[PDB]
Amino acid sequence: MPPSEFLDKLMGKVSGYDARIRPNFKGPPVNVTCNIFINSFGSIAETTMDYRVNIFLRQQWNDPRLAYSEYPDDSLDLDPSMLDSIWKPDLFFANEKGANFHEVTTDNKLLRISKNGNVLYSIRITLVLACPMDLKNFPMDVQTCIMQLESFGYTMNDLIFEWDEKGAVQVADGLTLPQFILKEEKDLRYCTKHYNTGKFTCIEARFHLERQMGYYLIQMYIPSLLIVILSWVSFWINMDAAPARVGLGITTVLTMTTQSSGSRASLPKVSYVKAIDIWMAVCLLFVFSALLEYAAVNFIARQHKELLRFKTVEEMRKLFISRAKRIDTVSRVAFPLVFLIFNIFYWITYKIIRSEDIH
Amino acid sequence: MPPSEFLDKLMGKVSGYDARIRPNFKGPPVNVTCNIFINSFGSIAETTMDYRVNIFLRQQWNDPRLAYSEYPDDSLDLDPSMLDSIWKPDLFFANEKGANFHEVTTDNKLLRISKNGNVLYSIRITLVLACPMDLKNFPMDVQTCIMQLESFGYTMNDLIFEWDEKGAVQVADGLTLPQFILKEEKDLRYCTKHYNTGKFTCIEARFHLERQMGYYLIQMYIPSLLIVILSWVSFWINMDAAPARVGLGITTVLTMTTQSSGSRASLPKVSYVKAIDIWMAVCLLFVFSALLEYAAVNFIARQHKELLRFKTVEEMRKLFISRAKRIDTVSRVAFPLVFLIFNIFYWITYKIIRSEDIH
Amino acid sequence: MPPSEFLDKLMGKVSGYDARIRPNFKGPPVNVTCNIFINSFGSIAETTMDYRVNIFLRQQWNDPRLAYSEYPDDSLDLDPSMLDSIWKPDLFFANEKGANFHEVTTDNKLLRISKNGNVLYSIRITLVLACPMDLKNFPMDVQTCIMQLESFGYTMNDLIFEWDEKGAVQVADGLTLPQFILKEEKDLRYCTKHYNTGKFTCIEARFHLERQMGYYLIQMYIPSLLIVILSWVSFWINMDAAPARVGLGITTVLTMTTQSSGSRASLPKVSYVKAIDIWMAVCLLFVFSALLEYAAVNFIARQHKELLRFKTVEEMRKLFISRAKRIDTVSRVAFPLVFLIFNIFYWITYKIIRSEDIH
Amino acid sequence: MPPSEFLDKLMGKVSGYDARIRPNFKGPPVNVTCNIFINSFGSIAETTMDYRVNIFLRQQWNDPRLAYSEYPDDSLDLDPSMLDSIWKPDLFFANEKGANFHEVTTDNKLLRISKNGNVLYSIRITLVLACPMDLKNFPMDVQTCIMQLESFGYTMNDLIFEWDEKGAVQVADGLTLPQFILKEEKDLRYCTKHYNTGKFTCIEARFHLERQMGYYLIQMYIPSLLIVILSWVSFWINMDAAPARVGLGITTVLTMTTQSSGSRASLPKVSYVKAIDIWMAVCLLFVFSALLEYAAVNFIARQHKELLRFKTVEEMRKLFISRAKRIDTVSRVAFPLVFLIFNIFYWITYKIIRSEDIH
Amino acid sequence: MPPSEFLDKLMGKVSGYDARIRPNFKGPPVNVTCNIFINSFGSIAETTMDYRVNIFLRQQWNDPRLAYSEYPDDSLDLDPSMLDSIWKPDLFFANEKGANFHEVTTDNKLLRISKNGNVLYSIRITLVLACPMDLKNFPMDVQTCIMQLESFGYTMNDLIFEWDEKGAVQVADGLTLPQFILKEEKDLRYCTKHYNTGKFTCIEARFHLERQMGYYLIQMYIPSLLIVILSWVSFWINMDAAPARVGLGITTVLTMTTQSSGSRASLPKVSYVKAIDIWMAVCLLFVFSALLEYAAVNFIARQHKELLRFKTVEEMRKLFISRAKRIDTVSRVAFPLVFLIFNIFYWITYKIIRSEDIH
Ligand SMILES: CCCCCc1cc(O)c2c(c1)OC(C)(C)[C@@H]1CCC(C)=C[C@@H]21
Ligand SMILES: CCCCCc1cc(O)c2c(c1)OC(C)(C)[C@@H]1CCC(C)=C[C@@H]21
Ligand SMILES: CCCCCc1cc(O)c2c(c1)OC(C)(C)[C@@H]1CCC(C)=C[C@@H]21
Ligand SMILES: CCCCCc1cc(O)c2c(c1)OC(C)(C)[C@@H]1CCC(C)=C[C@@H]21
């Protein structure tokens, strides 16, 4: 038998196969199993609130026509150039921007057909998909991103989309993300769509992402702790009669505010307050407080000198000097201890909220 | 009856149905009801003066042809591949940039036809639409964005566009915007278009947006208030013989001007003066004023020392020192009180103008 | 009469109408009147040296064929789907980048035909057009932007382009630009094109733009004047024995140079010197001069002390101190007066050059 | 013989050549040799993690049909306009984004055919290819970038891809990269692909890149070393009673932290710590340490003065002053020596790790 | 004679003209003269290493067919819609990225045909072309940019490309570049291409660009010279007992390093050292040297005071003070003179290297 003659008899002019009619017309809905392979994951960005993904869609359905039973083999690998003369199902993504095809040297496509009529359609597509991430806890967080596949033009009574029982979602070996660690959970559930026009089938796939705390810690946490230590430098040593202490204080407050403004740059604007904001605010409160500590001790010294200029003057000199020294030594010991207790409280509470949230 | 034979008899070669002629030719204008669904709203940006929206256009009209009365059911769900062999109406958007289609695995389209001839056309389109926002009050404002649908090629005597009486505009459940809160008002009115060529139908849809005052307050209002307090630090304590006071003043003025320049960065250039500009200008006036307060007290002290070098000298020492101290204490108490009264006046006036404007 | 039969008899197979031949072949040139409507104007940018415009091109010409005289009405509104079976004229823009079409739900097009044969062609097109703006006077300037329409493939002997006698250029009501004010002058003149291949027709349209001095004044003029006043603060008060005066001077010079560098950021690089550069340079000269004033008075005081250490020493003390005070008071009064006279001279000369230029 | 008659007899309607059937159908797999030429290499960027390349793909295979043996010459240079009427093989790139074609004046294509049936297909394509670079050692590193060619639609039993024995990869003469030096090694190996659908052929090409240490050294290494020397300036000279030393220290720490933040700007965020981070951290530790050295000597001097105010006081004056001077001189000599030993250790260890890694 | 009948007889179905066969088949190579017109030149950018150009390609060749000799005129201006039914030659650009066509209202094309058979093909194309500029001398340099036209699919034995003897390259009148001055030299030479597949014709056009030294001088040279003068301010006046001198020095070094980092921003990273780097490095060396001058004089004064505290002490006071003053006055006179001699040497050497290079 020649291949050309059979190939046109199956889906051509002698065949009454019209490509505009669904199989099992006036009949039970056409069931479709969908298997997705993820070639690459990338560009998870915040301002845009979307990511880039390259998938290998694969959908199988049955047709009562296209049952040959004439060649002795089970399946046939056809050309991808007659994929316009058969009944492809409609499928689109709901949270989709763009999503072009690929045509390098040939259009990337695959066609297979078995003896009973079960077909196999494979398409390569790069999708930009919108993920509405919640930045309640910015440095430490888990983000869930949604992929939705749904039928634009058919109702529930036709083209019901079902998932695949085994190996529904696969991932390429040795696939990594610079910022996030992918979680091998991939829970699958389906939610139908209701509209005024009708009821439309849909299926959903969920991915869990855990952010890496490697970059943020060095970029932000480590410098701020140093600047606090540097602010602490003044108290321990520099004598009361010091012009420089004030300059040191002003510079360390300026650098604190400019660094705090710099940190919240990439992040999109949000009404709620992030964890990094809380940490930076507390740090700014500490440095500012130090410059107030000097302000206090200098005013007490001024009172001491004013009374000294006016023995009776000697009577208050010792007590005022002792009070100033008392303020200094107490500041010295107290400021690190409270920073320490705040730090342990902050870390433990975030370490416990994340543990509860991940479950 | 076979489906193919009926399908070609309705709109094919045996049918005298020419797709270039409007229904009811030489007759009353073809009425068209338009229903819009909003799948996503996003990217409301200022410099570009435009936003991004993904809609589901739906338009229904009647045809005297395409009345079958042969199948026993009421409606038929046709393929979206013969949407080029019928009379689609022309429709374009006036404030439109771009507005591509979507073709993922199939072109997103929907066709329905009833027994009488009422058709249903559904198209998915992402529109970049230009909104001429007015930034009279930058932190607190309400923005109205306009969507216009109008007929390019037909006059009033044909293809009159009407809105839908019930459920004219729907929004997807759980749809949120990071910066703005959408208002569920959506007032609909239509304005016709007059040109030298002719008179053309149009319909308009209006959306109201309220900006969130969560990001701006932390980013700008909170640091400026701190810097003012820091400027105030000098007066209360540092003695008259102080080199540092001047350095503190210069730094706090530098940081004020650089922060003020930084704030007006994203915003597009406009001739009129925004509210944020007024607040920053007043704050800069306050900090600058402080450095003048020192300038005054130092000059008075200089006069005191000059006369002291020239008892007769003692006669003016007490009065000049008392005057310098008087200036200091008065500055101390007066500066916070006036800031407070300015702040309450500013907040109350903006809170009342917004209340009047929203109505 | 049926509409289809007439519609194909006019421009179809029974008609000898070949769409590849110009009307009046071997005859006088085909005259074409061109009317342009401006729907939107936007994105006037400097670095790119181009702007964005959305027009409604309209061109009318006469044909001896397509004269029906069979329907009782004067004109017919045809479909925009047979605009490929007639003789559209060629037209392109010379200073053009991009210039795509618009195809939303239908291609935006319009066809009309009268009894004598006068046709009406309307096309919507967004053009990016290059404007070679001259920044001789950057804050205050008038920019002229050119639109050119010319024939690529025909010589003078054919397809002569003429403007429209009445209402040649119209603008949409309530159309505004954020940065510029459009001038309602729109002078129209045409310049022919000469090439080695031949002589080609062209027509030109000119638009006048006046920049708004609302943003620049607050952004640049107002802060610099403040910083000059702040520089002046040192002279009036701070005594000769001052460490801080020098620090104040250095900071105000640093902030001046960084602000001057910041101002010339958006503007494209040009060889010639802009007005804003002149103003900033003079301001920098003033602040720098002040720090020199201190340098002078401090050196004179040093000479006074050196002689004092070496009565005979008392003999020169009074004269040197008086000279230092003389320098101080004279600096105090002279510096504002010269700034004032420079400012009035600068403003008056620019206000008069603009008045001469606009004419 | 006329050329047209032969040209249509070979691949036209009289020929039974169907372009949908692979040569040697129901037979051994079609072997394909692939030769690649690299016209340009460019845009190696880090954030995107991809590069741009312009290749000249060339693939040869044999066909039993298309064996003419009628013209007296060996080969024929055909038009590139009938490349749609023959059996092109499918080929796509796995780590591919974009990859458009080129159609300037004509589509860039080449067709050749020999007497036996060996064809030659040449295509020009610009590929954006993703390279997962590892930044373990940022200034000094070797990056390997992968190009993969694989068959989308055929299994192992068909269309086996083989490399070319001689001159498999060529490069254009005088081709240079601004940042990297290309290595003339280009090791070629092939890895097959396994999927649930089937087993698919693939071939891989590897390129080695060595970064230039010319820009980084001047941009980052040279300024930091200067700033350390500048920090060292205080110790050698400025006396114990110095207000300025503290200001110098604070400024040199501020500039160090801002420069360190600035350096890690272009680089994409990564969890692991880069070499440049280690160097900057050590440098910041050194400058910060100096400001502590002053803090220590000032506190010792304070103790000396406090006891002096309270002979018995003279008894401890000499020892405390000697201790302060001892601390100063020792700091003077010790700080450069340790910097030197750290620097030599760092350079030698990186120079040896790179030598081991390149092998 | 009717125009349609002749038009189809020349290149239609009755004509044996196959558009897939080159003229003079089995014959001498088809000679082609190429004339290029440059409508616009723009966007010469450094990071991308490419520029944008809009040309009017024009190529003429002879055909033995298409020789009518039936109309009484010499040439005919045909429609640009049958440019697909003739033998256009292949032509592509080797250093090409992108290069789209233009289709505004009509595709921009031109066809002419003479009595003998000489045709004229004109195409408008915007080309992004890669220029490998060498930044050995960054502020003053001459850049040569290459345009290459070559045949993709034919060998030397066919389609030989020749230049035009007269007026090979023309430029539009009044065409200017903001940054560069175009040189009216445009030397033309051709270099053939050798490949393993075969030998392919090519022709090359060279353009010379001279950079304007108007922007760079004001942006970089002028501020640095001012900052050096400002650094010099300290030496002449401020007495030895000065806290401020050190602060002035540190600020002027900080501003120098930040300005130096800022200057090398737009420029792409390169291993070799640019002229601007040399100038900035020398300037930084001068300012840094000044702060060392103070360090020296302060240490000498410290030795003087230390011996004074320990007449015998008076014996060394005069000599140490005289030495300190000697260092001051000598610094005063020497520093400007050496700057002057360096400046004249630098300018003269660059002015002479450019003169040699341009030849
Ligand atoms: C009796 C004299 C004690 C005054 C010295 C004093 C001053 C001071 O600012 C602080 C002190 C103690 O310790 C405590 C009270 C824990 C504060 C925690 C929070 C803040 C911002 C700073 C701490
Ligand atoms: C009798 C000595 C009083 C002079 C001290 C004085 C100085 C001064 O700058 C201010 C004072 C009072 O209070 C008032 C007058 C409310 C001002 C409001 C606006 C500004 C910028 C600052 C305030
Ligand atoms: C007799 C002592 C007078 C020297 C004080 C003196 C210093 C000085 O720098 C200036 C003075 C006067 O007024 C004039 C001369 C108008 C200058 C105009 C331009 C510049 C930059 C500053 C002004
Ligand atoms: C007996 C008095 C000696 C104290 C002076 C002293 C202070 C000091 O900070 C350093 C000294 C010595 O040398 C060594 C110990 C090598 C340190 C290496 C690492 C660091 C950050 C700095 C060095």
Ligand SMILES: CCCCCc1cc(O)c2c(c1)OC(C)(C)[C@@H]1CCC(C)=C[C@@H]21
């Ligand atoms: C005898 C005392 C002389 C020392 C004063 C001295 C210090 C000094 O730093 C320089 C002096 C002279 O002149 C020369 C030697 C020309 C140097 C040229 C290059 C540099 C960076 C600065 C210059």
Ligand SMILES: *[C@@H]1O[C@H](CO)[C@@H](O)[C@H](O)[C@H]1NC(C)=O
């Ligand atoms: C799809 O599956 C459902 C549930 O098993 C079944 O009721 C229906 O008939 C199936 N559709 C077919 C066989 O077309």
Ligand SMILES: *[C@@H]1O[C@H](CO)[C@@H](O)[C@H](O)[C@H]1NC(C)=O
């Ligand atoms: C559209 O509605 C108007 C108002 O009801 C009516 O006058 C007109 O005839 C309608 N057009 C039709 C029925 O084609």
Ligand SMILES: *[C@@H]1O[C@H](CO)[C@@H](O)[C@H](O)[C@H]1NC(C)=O
């Ligand atoms: C166009 O107008 C000119 C000037 O009125 C006239 O000479 C010419 O004949 C006209 N072209 C026609 C009528 O085709």
Ligand SMILES: *[C@@H]1O[C@H](CO)[C@@H](O)[C@H](O)[C@H]1NC(C)=O
């Ligand atoms: C391809 O090469 C293999 C190994 O030499 C051979 O077994 C196979 O038959 C070849 N395929 C052909 C000749 O079609």
Ligand SMILES: *[C@@H]1O[C@H](CO)[C@@H](O)[C@H](O)[C@H]1NC(C)=O
């Ligand atoms: C092209 O020119 C060369 C040199 O004059 C000549 O030898 C060749 O025959 C020409 N090609 C033709 C006439 O086809």
